[PDB]
Amino acid sequence: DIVLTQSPVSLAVSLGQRATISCRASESVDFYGNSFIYWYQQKPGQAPKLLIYRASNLESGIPARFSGSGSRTDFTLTIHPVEADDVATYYCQQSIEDPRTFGGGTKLEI
Amino acid sequence: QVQLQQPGAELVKPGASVKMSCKASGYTFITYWITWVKQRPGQGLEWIGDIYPGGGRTNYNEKFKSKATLTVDTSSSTAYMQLRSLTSEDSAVYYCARYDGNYVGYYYAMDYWGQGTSVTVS
Amino acid sequence: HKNNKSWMESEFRVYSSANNCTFEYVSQPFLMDKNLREFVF
Amino acid sequence: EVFNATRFASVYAWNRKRISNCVADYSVLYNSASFSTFKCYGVSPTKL
Ligand SMILES: *[C@@H]1O[C@H](CO)[C@@H](O)[C@H](O)[C@H]1NC(C)=O
C-alpha cells in the first residue's frame, strides 16, 4: 500500500499569491514515463472535483491557474493566482498499483 | 447531462445492513466503471472497490472485502452497495462516481463525482 | 511427385478434426540419420 | 506479428492467434502512442 503524505497540512495564501501543495509517495509512481497521480478539490459539504490527471494534465473546465508538477515519488500542485473560491481541501490519489490510496489532504485558507 | 444521484442521508441500527443506490444517467452506464470511496468526517478519502456494470465484474479492496458487497442494475442504470456488520467506525460519507479507465486517456482519473450519503450508526 | 522425384507428405490423415488446440512445439529432426534409435516415453 | 500484420480479417471472421511458450515484452505496448483505446478487464495494466 502506497502511503501518500501531503504537506503542509494547512496552508494560508492571500489573493494573487502562489499556493503549492506537495504530495509525497512512499513508493515510485512513474511507469514508463507516466505518473499516475491525480489532484482533486473538495469544497466543504460537496464531493471532490478533479483538477489534474496524470500529475501534469489539466482537466477540461478547470482554470489555468491550477497546475501540477513533479515526478518519481514527489509531486506538487501549484495554484497561481489563488482566488477567494479556492477555500477547500485538496487530495492526491495514486493509481499505479492497487489499492488506490488518497493523501491526508491540505486545507487552503485565504 | 451526466448525473449521479444519491440519497441525502441514511439511518441504520448498529449490526444491521443497509443497501445503497447510485442512479446513473446521461451516459452509457455499462461502458464506465463505478467505484465507492469512504470519507470519515474530518478525514481523507478511502477506496472501497471497483465494479464494471457490463458483466458484473467486481474488484474489492482487501480492507472492505468483507464489509461491502457491490452489485449493479443495468436495467435501471443504478449501482448498488451493501454494507454488513455495520459498527460505529462505519459512520462516514461514501461517494459513487465513474471513470473511463482508458490507459492512454484519463485512466483512473475521476472526472465526475456523486453527491454522497452520510450514515449515522446508533 | 513427378517433378520433385521424391515423396512429400500430402495431408495428415490421422485425424478428422482439430479443435481447442493448446500446445505446439517445433525442433530439429532426430529420427533421420544398421543404426538403432531408442526413445523412452 | 499480430499488431503489425499488414492484413486484418473482418470482425465477423475475426482472426485468432494463440500466444504461448514465450516471454511477453509488454513495454512495446506502453511505449506505443498510436493506440487510442487501452482497457483491461480483470487485471491491472501496470500489473500485467
Ligand atoms: C507496430 O510496431 C510498433 C513497434 O514498436 C509497435 O509499437 C506497435 O504497437 C505495432 N502496431 C501498430 C502500430 O499497430
Short mmCIF file of C-alpha atoms and ligand atoms in Angstrom, two decimals:
data_model
loop_
_atom_site.label_atom_id
_atom_site.label_comp_id
_atom_site.label_asym_id
_atom_site.label_seq_id
_atom_site.Cartn_x
_atom_site.Cartn_y
_atom_site.Cartn_z
CA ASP A 1 0.00 0.00 0.00
CA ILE A 2 1.48 3.31 -1.15
CA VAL A 3 1.22 5.93 1.61
CA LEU A 4 0.66 9.49 0.38
CA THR A 5 1.68 12.37 2.66
CA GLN A 6 0.51 15.91 1.88
CA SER A 7 2.41 18.93 3.20
CA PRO A 8 1.63 21.39 4.56
CA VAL A 9 -1.43 20.09 6.40
CA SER A 10 -2.80 23.65 6.40
CA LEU A 11 -1.85 26.45 4.00
CA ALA A 12 -2.75 30.14 4.14
CA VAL A 13 -2.34 32.13 0.91
CA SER A 14 -3.53 35.66 0.19
CA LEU A 15 -5.05 36.96 -3.04
CA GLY A 16 -2.74 36.91 -6.05
CA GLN A 17 -0.11 34.73 -4.37
CA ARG A 18 1.13 31.20 -5.11
CA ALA A 19 -0.07 28.11 -3.24
CA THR A 20 1.91 24.86 -3.52
CA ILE A 21 0.62 21.52 -2.21
CA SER A 22 3.16 18.69 -2.24
CA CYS A 23 2.17 15.01 -2.24
CA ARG A 24 4.91 12.54 -1.30
CA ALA A 25 4.65 8.88 -2.31
CA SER A 26 6.17 6.08 -0.25
CA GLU A 27 6.77 4.14 -3.49
CA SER A 28 7.57 5.00 -7.09
CA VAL A 29 4.61 6.24 -9.14
CA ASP A 30 6.24 6.70 -12.56
CA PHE A 31 5.52 3.88 -15.02
CA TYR A 32 7.18 4.15 -18.46
CA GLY A 33 7.09 7.94 -18.29
CA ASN A 34 3.51 8.07 -16.97
CA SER A 35 2.96 9.32 -13.41
CA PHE A 36 -0.40 8.12 -12.06
CA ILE A 37 -1.07 10.97 -9.63
CA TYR A 38 -4.40 12.80 -9.60
CA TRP A 39 -5.38 16.03 -7.86
CA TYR A 40 -8.86 16.79 -6.53
CA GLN A 41 -10.56 19.75 -4.86
CA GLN A 42 -13.24 19.03 -2.25
CA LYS A 43 -15.25 22.01 -1.06
CA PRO A 44 -16.91 21.55 2.36
CA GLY A 45 -20.25 19.80 2.07
CA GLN A 46 -19.50 18.81 -1.54
CA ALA A 47 -17.85 15.98 -3.45
CA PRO A 48 -14.25 16.32 -4.69
CA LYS A 49 -13.73 17.77 -8.17
CA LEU A 50 -10.92 16.56 -10.42
CA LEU A 51 -8.28 19.16 -11.29
CA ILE A 52 -5.12 17.42 -12.54
CA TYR A 53 -4.79 13.93 -14.02
CA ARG A 54 -1.51 12.11 -14.72
CA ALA A 55 0.13 14.75 -12.47
CA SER A 56 0.70 17.02 -15.49
CA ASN A 57 -2.57 17.38 -17.48
CA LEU A 58 -5.32 19.87 -16.64
CA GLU A 59 -8.89 18.58 -16.69
CA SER A 60 -11.27 20.35 -19.07
CA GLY A 61 -13.20 23.18 -17.44
CA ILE A 62 -10.54 23.83 -14.77
CA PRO A 63 -8.95 27.31 -14.84
CA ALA A 64 -5.34 27.53 -16.00
CA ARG A 65 -4.25 28.76 -12.55
CA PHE A 66 -4.21 25.17 -11.26
CA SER A 67 -1.09 23.31 -12.40
CA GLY A 68 0.61 20.05 -11.47
CA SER A 69 4.28 19.13 -11.37
CA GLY A 70 6.65 16.50 -10.01
CA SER A 71 7.97 13.05 -10.81
CA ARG A 72 9.15 9.81 -9.16
CA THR A 73 7.87 9.83 -5.53
CA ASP A 74 7.34 13.59 -5.12
CA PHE A 75 4.59 15.65 -6.74
CA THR A 76 3.43 19.24 -6.24
CA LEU A 77 0.21 21.07 -7.11
CA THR A 78 0.56 24.78 -7.87
CA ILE A 79 -2.29 27.32 -7.80
CA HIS A 80 -1.39 30.73 -9.21
CA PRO A 81 -3.06 33.10 -8.79
CA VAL A 82 -5.14 31.97 -5.80
CA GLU A 83 -8.72 33.26 -5.75
CA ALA A 84 -11.26 33.57 -2.94
CA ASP A 85 -13.25 30.50 -4.04
CA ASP A 86 -10.18 28.27 -3.54
CA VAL A 87 -11.02 27.51 0.12
CA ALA A 88 -11.28 23.70 0.10
CA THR A 89 -9.32 20.53 0.88
CA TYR A 90 -7.02 19.15 -1.82
CA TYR A 91 -6.34 15.42 -2.10
CA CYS A 92 -3.77 13.46 -4.10
CA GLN A 93 -4.56 9.97 -5.41
CA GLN A 94 -2.26 7.33 -6.88
CA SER A 95 -3.29 4.57 -9.27
CA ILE A 96 -0.07 2.80 -10.31
CA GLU A 97 -0.87 -0.18 -8.06
CA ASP A 98 -3.87 -1.40 -6.10
CA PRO A 99 -5.26 -0.46 -3.70
CA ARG A 100 -5.60 3.17 -4.76
CA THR A 101 -4.94 5.48 -1.81
CA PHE A 102 -5.65 9.14 -1.08
CA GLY A 103 -3.47 11.61 0.77
CA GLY A 104 -4.21 13.20 4.12
CA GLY A 105 -5.38 16.39 2.44
CA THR A 106 -4.31 20.03 2.57
CA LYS A 107 -6.70 22.73 3.79
CA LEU A 108 -6.33 26.06 1.97
CA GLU A 109 -7.25 29.30 3.76
CA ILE A 110 -7.47 32.82 2.37
CA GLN B 1 -26.29 15.69 -18.84
CA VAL B 2 -24.38 13.10 -16.81
CA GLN B 3 -25.83 12.84 -13.30
CA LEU B 4 -25.09 10.54 -10.36
CA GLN B 5 -27.77 10.80 -7.68
CA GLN B 6 -27.52 9.59 -4.08
CA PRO B 7 -29.86 9.95 -1.09
CA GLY B 8 -29.01 12.74 1.32
CA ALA B 9 -28.70 10.59 4.44
CA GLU B 10 -29.37 7.09 5.74
CA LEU B 11 -30.00 5.85 9.29
CA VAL B 12 -29.23 2.23 10.19
CA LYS B 13 -29.04 0.49 13.55
CA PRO B 14 -25.66 -0.98 14.56
CA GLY B 15 -25.17 -4.58 13.47
CA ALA B 16 -27.76 -4.30 10.69
CA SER B 17 -27.32 -3.98 6.91
CA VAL B 18 -28.02 -1.05 4.58
CA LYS B 19 -28.46 -1.10 0.80
CA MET B 20 -27.36 1.84 -1.34
CA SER B 21 -28.44 3.16 -4.74
CA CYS B 22 -26.40 5.26 -7.18
CA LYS B 23 -28.63 6.28 -10.09
CA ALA B 24 -26.71 6.97 -13.31
CA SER B 25 -28.00 8.96 -16.28
CA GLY B 26 -26.80 10.92 -19.29
CA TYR B 27 -24.27 8.30 -20.42
CA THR B 28 -23.92 4.63 -21.35
CA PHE B 29 -23.87 3.08 -17.88
CA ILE B 30 -22.32 -0.25 -18.92
CA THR B 31 -19.27 1.40 -20.52
CA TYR B 32 -17.99 3.14 -17.36
CA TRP B 33 -16.72 1.58 -14.14
CA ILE B 34 -18.34 2.57 -10.84
CA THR B 35 -16.50 2.81 -7.53
CA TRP B 36 -17.25 3.83 -3.95
CA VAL B 37 -14.98 5.97 -1.78
CA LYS B 38 -15.33 6.21 2.00
CA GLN B 39 -14.56 9.53 3.73
CA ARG B 40 -14.72 9.71 7.51
CA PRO B 41 -15.91 13.13 8.78
CA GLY B 42 -12.76 15.22 9.16
CA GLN B 43 -10.57 12.57 7.48
CA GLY B 44 -9.43 11.75 3.95
CA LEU B 45 -10.75 9.51 1.19
CA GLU B 46 -10.57 5.71 1.20
CA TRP B 47 -11.19 3.36 -1.72
CA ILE B 48 -13.70 0.54 -1.26
CA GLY B 49 -13.97 -1.31 -4.57
CA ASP B 50 -14.29 -1.18 -8.35
CA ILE B 51 -17.11 -2.74 -10.38
CA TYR B 52 -17.90 -2.81 -14.11
CA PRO B 53 -21.63 -2.69 -14.97
CA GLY B 54 -21.05 -4.73 -18.13
CA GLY B 55 -20.83 -8.33 -17.00
CA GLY B 56 -20.80 -7.58 -13.28
CA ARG B 57 -17.04 -7.93 -12.81
CA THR B 58 -16.18 -6.80 -9.29
CA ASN B 59 -12.91 -5.72 -7.67
CA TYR B 60 -12.81 -5.31 -3.89
CA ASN B 61 -10.30 -3.74 -1.54
CA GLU B 62 -8.76 -6.14 0.97
CA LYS B 63 -9.95 -4.00 3.90
CA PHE B 64 -13.53 -3.67 2.60
CA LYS B 65 -13.85 -7.13 1.03
CA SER B 66 -15.92 -8.47 3.94
CA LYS B 67 -17.69 -5.20 4.80
CA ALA B 68 -19.02 -4.03 1.41
CA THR B 69 -20.80 -6.07 -1.27
CA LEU B 70 -21.28 -4.34 -4.62
CA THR B 71 -23.89 -5.15 -7.27
CA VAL B 72 -25.25 -3.49 -10.41
CA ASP B 73 -28.65 -2.95 -12.04
CA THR B 74 -28.13 -2.30 -15.75
CA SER B 75 -31.89 -2.16 -16.32
CA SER B 76 -32.24 0.88 -14.04
CA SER B 77 -28.64 2.10 -14.55
CA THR B 78 -28.23 2.09 -10.77
CA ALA B 79 -25.20 0.95 -8.76
CA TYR B 80 -25.86 -0.89 -5.50
CA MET B 81 -23.54 -1.00 -2.49
CA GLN B 82 -24.43 -3.10 0.56
CA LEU B 83 -22.69 -2.80 3.93
CA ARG B 84 -22.96 -5.57 6.53
CA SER B 85 -21.89 -5.80 10.18
CA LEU B 86 -22.10 -2.02 10.49
CA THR B 87 -20.39 -0.53 13.55
CA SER B 88 -19.69 2.94 14.93
CA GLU B 89 -16.49 3.24 12.87
CA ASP B 90 -18.52 2.83 9.65
CA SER B 91 -20.24 6.22 10.03
CA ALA B 92 -18.83 8.16 7.08
CA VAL B 93 -19.68 9.64 3.68
CA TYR B 94 -19.41 7.36 0.64
CA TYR B 95 -19.26 8.78 -2.89
CA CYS B 96 -20.25 6.94 -6.07
CA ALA B 97 -18.56 8.03 -9.28
CA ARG B 98 -17.47 6.86 -12.73
CA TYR B 99 -14.11 6.77 -14.50
CA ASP B 100 -13.42 5.97 -18.15
CA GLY B 101 -10.42 3.78 -17.28
CA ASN B 102 -8.55 4.35 -20.56
CA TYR B 103 -4.79 3.94 -20.15
CA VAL B 104 -3.86 6.32 -22.99
CA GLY B 105 -6.59 8.60 -21.66
CA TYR B 106 -7.77 9.55 -18.18
CA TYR B 107 -7.20 6.02 -16.78
CA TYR B 108 -8.22 6.18 -13.08
CA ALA B 109 -8.79 9.94 -13.30
CA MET B 110 -12.13 10.56 -11.63
CA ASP B 111 -13.73 13.45 -13.51
CA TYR B 112 -17.26 13.43 -12.06
CA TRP B 113 -18.44 12.56 -8.55
CA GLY B 114 -21.71 11.74 -6.88
CA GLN B 115 -23.06 13.91 -4.08
CA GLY B 116 -22.52 11.20 -1.45
CA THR B 117 -24.55 9.95 1.51
CA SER B 118 -23.84 10.25 5.23
CA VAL B 119 -24.82 7.40 7.58
CA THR B 120 -25.29 7.61 11.35
CA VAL B 121 -24.82 4.28 13.13
CA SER B 122 -26.53 4.47 16.53
CA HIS C 1 5.53 -36.05 -57.14
CA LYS C 2 6.90 -36.44 -60.67
CA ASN C 3 8.68 -33.07 -60.69
CA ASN C 4 10.39 -33.37 -57.30
CA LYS C 5 11.02 -37.11 -57.89
CA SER C 6 10.59 -37.74 -54.16
CA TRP C 7 7.98 -38.43 -51.51
CA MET C 8 6.44 -35.45 -49.71
CA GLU C 9 3.66 -35.56 -47.12
CA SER C 10 0.28 -34.87 -48.72
CA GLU C 11 -2.01 -34.42 -45.72
CA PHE C 12 -2.44 -35.50 -42.10
CA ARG C 13 -4.87 -38.41 -42.49
CA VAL C 14 -4.62 -39.47 -38.84
CA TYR C 15 -7.30 -37.10 -37.51
CA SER C 16 -10.61 -35.76 -38.77
CA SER C 17 -10.92 -32.54 -36.75
CA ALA C 18 -8.66 -30.20 -34.73
CA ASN C 19 -10.47 -28.19 -32.04
CA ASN C 20 -9.33 -26.44 -28.86
CA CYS C 21 -5.62 -26.70 -29.63
CA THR C 22 -3.38 -25.91 -26.65
CA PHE C 23 0.33 -26.58 -27.21
CA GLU C 24 2.66 -26.74 -30.20
CA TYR C 25 6.40 -27.41 -30.48
CA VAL C 26 8.95 -27.50 -33.31
CA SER C 27 12.53 -28.77 -33.20
CA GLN C 28 15.20 -30.28 -35.41
CA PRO C 29 14.53 -33.83 -36.66
CA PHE C 30 16.12 -36.68 -34.71
CA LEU C 31 14.60 -39.78 -36.37
CA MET C 32 16.50 -39.13 -39.62
CA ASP C 33 20.16 -40.15 -39.97
CA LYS C 34 22.44 -50.58 -39.11
CA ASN C 35 21.68 -47.74 -36.68
CA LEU C 36 19.46 -48.24 -33.63
CA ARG C 37 17.26 -45.44 -32.28
CA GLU C 38 15.83 -45.66 -28.75
CA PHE C 39 13.20 -43.35 -27.23
CA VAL C 40 11.81 -43.50 -23.70
CA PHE C 41 8.32 -42.06 -23.25
CA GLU D 1 3.45 -10.10 -35.75
CA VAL D 2 -0.12 -9.70 -34.51
CA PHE D 3 -0.06 -5.92 -34.14
CA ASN D 4 1.97 -5.02 -37.25
CA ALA D 5 0.33 -7.52 -39.62
CA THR D 6 -0.50 -5.77 -42.89
CA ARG D 7 -3.87 -7.51 -43.34
CA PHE D 8 -6.51 -7.93 -40.64
CA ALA D 9 -9.59 -10.11 -41.05
CA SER D 10 -13.13 -8.78 -40.81
CA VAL D 11 -14.97 -8.59 -37.49
CA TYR D 12 -17.39 -11.39 -38.40
CA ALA D 13 -14.40 -13.55 -39.39
CA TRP D 14 -12.03 -12.28 -36.69
CA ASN D 15 -8.61 -13.91 -36.74
CA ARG D 16 -7.47 -15.64 -33.54
CA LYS D 17 -3.79 -16.18 -32.74
CA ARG D 18 -2.61 -18.29 -29.80
CA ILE D 19 0.41 -16.92 -27.92
CA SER D 20 2.24 -19.35 -25.64
CA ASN D 21 5.67 -20.66 -24.63
CA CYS D 22 7.32 -17.25 -24.87
CA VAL D 23 8.27 -14.23 -22.80
CA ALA D 24 5.88 -11.35 -23.40
CA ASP D 25 7.51 -7.91 -23.53
CA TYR D 26 4.61 -5.55 -22.81
CA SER D 27 6.89 -2.49 -22.85
CA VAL D 28 6.20 -2.05 -26.58
CA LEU D 29 2.50 -1.65 -25.75
CA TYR D 30 3.05 1.18 -23.26
CA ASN D 31 5.68 2.84 -25.46
CA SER D 32 3.33 2.83 -28.46
CA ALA D 33 1.28 6.02 -28.72
CA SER D 34 -0.80 5.08 -31.79
CA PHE D 35 -3.18 3.17 -29.51
CA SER D 36 -6.42 5.07 -28.87
CA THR D 37 -8.20 2.63 -26.52
CA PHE D 38 -6.41 0.57 -23.86
CA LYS D 39 -8.86 -1.01 -21.40
CA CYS D 40 -8.00 -4.06 -19.28
CA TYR D 41 -10.66 -6.13 -17.51
CA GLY D 42 -9.86 -8.31 -14.51
CA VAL D 43 -6.18 -7.32 -14.43
CA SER D 44 -4.27 -4.13 -13.71
CA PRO D 45 -2.36 -2.97 -16.81
CA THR D 46 0.61 -1.97 -14.64
CA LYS D 47 0.39 -5.44 -13.06
CA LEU D 48 0.44 -7.21 -16.44
C1 LIG E 1 3.82 -1.80 -34.81
O1 LIG E 1 5.16 -1.92 -34.32
C2 LIG E 1 5.50 -0.97 -33.30
C3 LIG E 1 6.97 -1.15 -33.00
O2 LIG E 1 7.33 -0.51 -31.78
C4 LIG E 1 4.61 -1.17 -32.08
O3 LIG E 1 4.92 -0.18 -31.11
C5 LIG E 1 3.14 -1.06 -32.48
O4 LIG E 1 2.31 -1.40 -31.37
C6 LIG E 1 2.83 -2.00 -33.64
N1 LIG E 1 1.42 -1.94 -34.05
C7 LIG E 1 0.74 -0.90 -34.58
C8 LIG E 1 1.48 0.39 -34.81
O5 LIG E 1 -0.45 -1.01 -34.86
#
